[PDB]
């Protein structure tokens, strides 16, 4: 046994690509920490992604995480791509570089740092922490304030 932990996120953007932002709340035993930023220009997939990575970078110590989210963007790359995308060496079937990397990979390399529980949140029928990253991230994304400098223009 190492350390509960409890941790809800959430990505949203404005356009495609547009302003957006991400919400994650880290849950402790009661303790809550709350993350959140917003972006100028970016994507509903990059920010699903930023707020997992933002959530777990943030843990000092191995821990049991539970990791809510109700990204179909995430949940359909755990689920489906990065297990092929390793063996492939982060590389579509086409020897051809995948989209979004440097955070995938990010998201990765954070993820094998803990024990991950993955929890898709369904028809919405998610905790009011799923709503909170959610007002967290659209209010972000009505104020972004920094440059998503890893997102590659697709204009
Ligand atoms: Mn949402």
């Not at 060496?89 to 020897?95: F, S």
């Not at 998201?107 to 993955?118: E, F, R, S, V, Y």
């Not at 967290?136 to 997102?151: F, I, K, Q, S, V």
């Amino acid at each position: 046994m190492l350390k509960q932990v409890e941790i809800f996120t959430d990505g949203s953007c404005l356009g495609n690509p547009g302003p957006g932002g991400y919400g994650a709340i880290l849950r402790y035993r009661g303790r809550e920490k709350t993350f959140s930023a917003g972006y100028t220009r970016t994507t509903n997939n990059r920010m699903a992604l930023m707020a997992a990575i933002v959530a777990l970078e943030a843990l000092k110590e191995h821990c049991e995480v539970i990791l809510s989210t109700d990204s179909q963007y995430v949940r359909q790359g755990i689920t489906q791509w990065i297990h092929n995308w390793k063996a492939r060496g982060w590389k579509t079937a086409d020897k051809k570089p995948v989209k979004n990397v440097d955070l995938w990979q990010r998201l990765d390399a954070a993820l094998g740092q803990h024990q991950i529980k993955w929890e898709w949140v369904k028809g919405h029928a998610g905790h009011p922490e799923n709503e909170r990253c959610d007002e967290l991230a659209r209010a972000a994304a009505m104020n972004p304030t920094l440059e998503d400098t890893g997102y590659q223009v697709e204009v």
